[PDB]
C-alpha cells in the first residue's frame, strides 16, 4: 500500500513511467492549461 | 554526474584522450537518479558552453 515509486524507485515499471512524463512534457504543451485527467474503460 | 549534481565545475570534468586527439568527458560516478539529473539545466549551459 505505497507508491513504487518511492520503495522501488529502480524498477521498470518506474523507468516506463518516466518514459510516459517524457512523451507527456512534449504533448502538454500548448494545451489551454496545465490539468491532466487520467481515465479508463 | 558530478557536475550535473552540482559539487564540480565546467573544467574539471573535460579531459585529453593519449592517442585521439579529442577531449571528452566520462560520466563518473553512478548516480542513483539519472534520468531526473539530465533534466537539470546545467546540462544545457553546459552544451551552450
Known amino acids: ?41 | 554526474s558530478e557536475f550535473l549534481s552540482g559539487q564540480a565545475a565546467a573544467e574539471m570534468i573535460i579531459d585529453k584522450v593519449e592517442g585521439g586527439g579529442f577531449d571528452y568527458i566520462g560520466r563518473g560516478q553512478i548516480p542513483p537518479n539519472p534520468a531526473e539529473l539530465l533534466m537539470h539545466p546545467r546540462f544545457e549551459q553546459l552544451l551552450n558552453w
Open chain 1, 1 to 41: 500500500d505505497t507508491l513504487l515509486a518511492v520503495g522501488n524507485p529502480a524498477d521498470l515499471a518506474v523507468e516506463a513511467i518516466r518514459g510516459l512524463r517524457t512523451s507527456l512534457h512534449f504533448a502538454m504543451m500548448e494545451a489551454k492549461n496545465n490539468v491532466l485527467m487520467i481515465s479508463g474503460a
